[PDB]
Amino acid sequence: SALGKLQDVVNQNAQALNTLVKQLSSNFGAISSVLNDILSRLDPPEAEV
Amino acid sequence: VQLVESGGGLVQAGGSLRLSCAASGLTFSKYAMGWFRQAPGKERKFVATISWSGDSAFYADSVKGRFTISRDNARNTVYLQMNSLKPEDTAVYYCAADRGMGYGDFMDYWGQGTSVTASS
Amino acid sequence: TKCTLKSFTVEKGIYQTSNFRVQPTESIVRFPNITNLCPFGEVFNATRFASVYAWNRKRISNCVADYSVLYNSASFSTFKCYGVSPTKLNDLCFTNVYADSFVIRGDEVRQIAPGQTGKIADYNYKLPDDFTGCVIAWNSNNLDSKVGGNYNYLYRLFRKSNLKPFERDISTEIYQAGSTPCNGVEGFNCYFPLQSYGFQPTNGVGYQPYRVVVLSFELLHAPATVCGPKKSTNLVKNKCVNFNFNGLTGTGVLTESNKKFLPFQQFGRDIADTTDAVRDPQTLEILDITPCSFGGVSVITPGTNTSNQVAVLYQDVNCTEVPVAIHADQLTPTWRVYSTGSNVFQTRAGCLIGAEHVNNSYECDIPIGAGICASYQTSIIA
Amino acid sequence: PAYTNSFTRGVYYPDKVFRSSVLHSTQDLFLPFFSNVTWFHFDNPVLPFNDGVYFASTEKSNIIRGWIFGTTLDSKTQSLLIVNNATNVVIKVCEFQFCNDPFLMESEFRVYSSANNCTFEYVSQPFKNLREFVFKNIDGYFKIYSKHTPINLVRDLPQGFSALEPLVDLPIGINITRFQTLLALHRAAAYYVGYLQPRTFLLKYNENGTITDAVDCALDPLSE
Ligand SMILES: *[C@@H]1O[C@H](CO)[C@@H](O[C@@H]2O[C@H](CO)[C@@H](O)[C@H](O)[C@H]2NC(C)=O)[C@H](O)[C@H]1NC(C)=O
Ligand SMILES: *[C@@H]1O[C@H](CO)[C@@H](O)[C@H](O)[C@H]1NC(C)=O
Ligand SMILES: *[C@@H]1O[C@H](CO)[C@@H](O)[C@H](O)[C@H]1NC(C)=O
Ligand SMILES: *[C@@H]1O[C@H](CO)[C@@H](O)[C@H](O)[C@H]1NC(C)=O
Ligand SMILES: *[C@@H]1O[C@H](CO)[C@@H](O)[C@H](O)[C@H]1NC(C)=O
Ligand SMILES: *[C@@H]1O[C@H](CO)[C@@H](O)[C@H](O)[C@H]1NC(C)=O
Ligand SMILES: *[C@@H]1O[C@H](CO)[C@@H](O)[C@H](O)[C@H]1NC(C)=O
Ligand SMILES: *[C@@H]1O[C@H](CO)[C@@H](O)[C@H](O)[C@H]1NC(C)=O
Ligand SMILES: *[C@@H]1O[C@H](CO)[C@@H](O)[C@H](O)[C@H]1NC(C)=O
Structure with a gap:
């Protein structure tokens, strides 16, 4: 654990960045989290919602 | 009831x-x-069909390659592109309508007939 | 650079002006080796189809039944796909893929339609309102017409109540119309309902039976079984392409793989759950997926008051596809001199255009990165 | 009836994704670690389905031949059936009726009631190996997972870890509440039954995408 102070920062950054990418797979209330499914299975007047 | 045709086999050369x-x-x-x-040796042979909405369509065996159909939901008009004419297609064509579509011996109204003469 | 700084003079330095991204070309599609081939062929190529009194709601499930052969079958007259346009039948099916057939008499084919009663739509077969499926009537004289008439398909010409839509009505008892009872021995009010289609060669096209089959498509909470086939192109490699395998879609570059799936996986993910490998449904081969190249573009300038030359850095890109990365053939002839030339240098930071490499070493003037700097010596050097 | 322990058995691949040298946490219907499961071993009672079923068996002779599934198990409503005939597997969903005691040099077919109103069929090809199966039924689909393993032990479920690879899904699209086993009679078996419920697991994928270990996130505080 000698170089813990140098390790911690690395770890922190990595995990924060990881938490960003995973956040890209959440609905937030929509019907799907993948954009082409909304663009395909729905109509322009209401897909925008 | 007022079903009318147009055209005319005036082909000065190869044309449609x-x-x-x-x-x-x-x-x-x-x-x-x-x-x-209507070929002079044949009956009112079927050529092309088109739906109520102008989408459902499937041509006959003889014209599924060259002879295009189209109709309009409004405007009361309808077109058939008789492209790359053939002498066997020198015929009296009748536009006509019915409840269904496609090679019905009986139909609601028949056209006035266009005697297109694909010449050589 | 002048437009992004909103100035008419720029100081010596390195500025970032825009991004860039390679664009897809082919948009290929791959789907499984369909080869499932419903046995509709006989119920297209048999000599005696169902009977209007005994037209079974035959449940044919779990296979592909192509209809393109129907469209180009060169026999249809009143082929009509209600609900969905026939041209878009093979692409998309519906659940409840039940199937029906008969060789109907064609004098009332136009009576067989949704929301239209009549005689055949009354005693023989009725279409429910808003029909979702295909009723297909075509010419079948040459086979179902024997000498003196093919009396092989009788028909219930009498029924107590108008048929419920989609009801195969089979019965032996005779029509009731009066009050005086038939004594089994046929009387004056017996009225044998199962009359016989006169299907003679003497009949015309309408009088002769149009064969009508019914691909009915309902909506019940049961999995769909039979649908039309799917087309699929061939696959390209080592090119930024759009792709859609059997269900999942994306854009990227597909390359040969070194990993090894188990015999039942289809694709593969990594940490953070991004798909990065796939198996082609028709060859059982694993392909790696890589994003199409993207990055930023920066401009190195020695200051407006000093000179008027520039150099361009495309960050972390192999220094070959720059004229395709930016749409160089669309830009002005003055941009085009900065997408290729004699001075092309590959650094750990990217692709550098417009400056010449030198073996000498000086103090850093403009930082490019990874130990590389650039400056002006009258020409830009790196 | 002479229960026994479940030493971390009954783990199956939850989907068709490939993963390499990773730990992945999932939530699904599983068999909890260290439970007591009924042990029949001559035995053929009615047992409820309850959201899914684990099933192990070890037998030298081929006594166990298949299974019966359904809701009412009579002429009224549709049922489902799997049978092995030593060369082929018959799977049917026909409308049978009840049999107070179905069972099978060979005398067999004593299970048969009648076969009116069929709606699907999937004839296919098929101290002894412990044979393990997992049955689920959801979204109109019926899913089966299985595994076979050499065994050297008596009367006991072996310890250790091994995963249940899928082998079939069926678009049966029916409902189901209880089931039966099928044994061939010819004048030594083993017959375990457990149950599944919605519990969260953590799974380990090695360098080749094989599940080699798991932990149950509700067995212990240390597991939590
Ligand atoms: C998909 O169908 C094609 C059509 O034949 C199969 O292609 C052949 O596959 C064999 C191996 O099974 C090769 O030896 C041949 O050279 C292939 N020929 C052609 C023209 O493709 C293909 O194997 C099938 N794939 C699957 C997964 O069933
Ligand atoms: C029926 O058979 C004929 C000739 O045997 C063939 O041309 C036709 O395509 C077959 N029907 C279908 C639907 O393929
Ligand atoms: C331009 O200005 C910069 C700093 O403002 C200066 O260093 C440079 O020498 C000037 N060039 C000329 C040609 O005067
Ligand atoms: C850059 O592209 C060239 C052209 O094929 C290739 O030979 C070289 O290996 C590539 N290098 C890198 C670092 O991408
Ligand atoms: C610079 O170094 C390279 C690397 O060996 C060499 O090929 C070249 O001749 C040297 N001189 C010049 C002027 O580039
Ligand atoms: C073992 O089985 C007995 C029998 O009912 C039960 O009481 C007990 O809870 C089981 N053990 C565990 C750990 O569930
Ligand atoms: C046969 O099974 C179908 C499928 O559910 C059902 O609709 C029908 O009523 C059944 N008929 C008889 C006679 O069991
Ligand atoms: C099965 O039966 C239950 C009640 O007996 C019913 O609620 C459910 O909808 C049925 N499911 C199917 C698929 O028939
Ligand atoms: C993975 O597979 C390779 C060969 O396919 C084998 O050499 C290696 O031992 C395997 N890894 C494990 C952990 O079994």
């Missing part, structure tokens, strides 16, 4: 034609339509 029909007697967006042909 268009049949412009119109059901100016009844409603145009309720009855599915078909164009038929």
Whole structure:
């Protein structure tokens, strides 16, 4: 654990960045989290919602 | 009831034609339509079909490669592109409508007939 | 650079002006080796189809039944796909893929339609309102017409109540119309309902039977079984392409793989759950997926008051596809001199255009990165 | 009836994704670690389905031949059936009726009631190996997972870890509440039954995408 102070920062950054990418797979209330499914299975007047 | 045709086999050389029909007697967006042909040696042979909405269509065996159909939901008119004419296609074509569509011996109204003469 | 700084003079330095991204070309599609081939062929190529009194709601499930052969079958007259346009039948099916057939008499084919009663739509077969499926009537004289008439398909010409839509009505008892009872021995009010289609060669096309089959498509909470086939192109490699395998879609570059799936996985993910490998449904081969190249573009300038030359850095990109990365053939002839030339240098930071490499070493003037700097010596050097 | 322990058995691949040298946490219907499961071993009672079923068996002779599934198990409503005939597997969903005691040099077919109103069929090809199966039924689909393993032990479920690879899904699209086993009679078996419920697991994928270990996130505080 000698170089813990140098390790911690690395770890922190990595995990924060990881938490960003995973956040890209959440609905937030929509019907799907993948954009082409909304663009395909729905109509322009209401897909925008 | 007022089913009219157009065109005319005036081919000074190799060329095509268009049949412009119109059901100016009844409603145009309720009855599915078909164009038929009369060779001098044959009967009112089926050529092309088209739906009530102008989408469902499937040509006959003889004309599924070159002879294009189209009809309009409004405007009461309808067209058939008679592209790359053939002498066997020198015929009296009848635009006509019915409840169904496609090679019906009986139909609601037949056209006035266009005697297109694909010449050489 | 002048437009992004909103100035008419720029100081010596390195500025970032825009991004860039390679664009897809082919948009390929791959789907499984369909080869499932419903046995509709006989119920297209048999000699005696169902009977209007005994037209079974035959449940044919779990296979592909192509209809393109129907569209180009060169026999149809009143082929009509209600609900969905026939041209878009093979692409998309519906659940409840039940199937029906008969060789009907064609004098009332136009009576067989949704929302239209009549005689055949009354005693023989009725279409429910808003029909979702295909009723297909075509010419079948040459086979179902024997000498003196093919009396092989009788028909119930009498029924107590108008048929419920989609009801195969089979019965032996005779029509009731009066009050005086038939004594089994046929009387004056017996009225044998199962009359016989006169299907003679003497009949015309309408009088002769149009064969009508019914691909009915309902909506029940049961999995769909039979649908039309799917087309699929061939596959390209080592090109930024759009792709859609059997269900999942994306854009990227597909390359040969070194990993090894188990015999039942289809694709593969990594940490953070991004798909990065796939198996082609028709060859059982694993392909790696890589994003199409993207990055930023920066401009190195020695200051407006000093000179008027520039150099361009495309960050972390192999220094070959720059004229395709930016749409160089669309830009002005003055941009085009900065997408290729004699001075092309590959650094750990990217692709550098417009400056010449030198073996000498000086103090850093403009930082490019990874130990590389650039400056002006009258020409830009790196 | 002479229960026994479940030493970390009954783990199956939850989907068709490939993963390499990773730990992945999932939530699904599983068999909890260290439970007591009924042990029949001559035995053929009615047992409820309850959201899914684990099933192990070890037998030298081929006594166990298949299974019966359904809701009412009579002429009224549709049922489902799997049978092995030593060369082929018959799977049917026909409308049978009840049999107070179905069972099978060979005398067999004593299970048969009648076969009116069929709606699907999937004839296919098929101290002894412990044979393990997992049955689920959801979204109109019926899913089966299985595994076979050499065994050297008596009367006991072996310890250790091994995963249940899928082998079939069926678009049966029916409902189901209880089931039966099928044994061939010819004048030594083993017959375990457990149950599944919605519990969260953590799974380990090695360098080749094989599940080699798991932990149950509700067995212990240390597991939590
Ligand atoms: C998909 O169908 C094609 C059509 O034949 C199969 O292609 C052949 O596959 C064999 C191996 O099974 C090769 O030896 C041949 O050279 C292939 N020929 C052609 C023209 O493709 C293919 O194997 C099938 N794939 C699957 C997964 O069933
Ligand atoms: C029926 O058979 C004929 C000739 O045997 C063939 O041309 C036709 O394509 C077959 N029907 C279908 C639907 O393929
Ligand atoms: C331009 O200005 C910069 C700093 O403002 C200076 O260093 C440079 O020498 C000037 N060039 C000329 C040609 O005067
Ligand atoms: C850059 O592209 C060239 C052209 O094929 C290739 O030979 C070289 O290996 C590539 N290098 C890198 C670092 O991408
Ligand atoms: C610079 O160094 C390279 C690397 O060996 C060499 O090929 C070249 O001749 C040297 N001189 C010049 C002027 O580039
Ligand atoms: C073992 O089985 C007995 C029998 O009912 C039960 O009481 C007990 O809870 C089981 N053990 C565990 C750990 O569930
Ligand atoms: C046969 O099974 C179908 C499928 O559910 C059902 O609709 C029908 O009523 C059944 N008929 C008989 C006679 O069991
Ligand atoms: C099965 O039966 C239950 C009640 O007995 C019913 O609620 C459910 O909808 C049925 N499911 C199917 C698929 O028939
Ligand atoms: C993975 O597979 C390779 C060969 O396919 C094998 O050499 C290696 O031992 C395997 N890894 C494990 C952990 O079994």
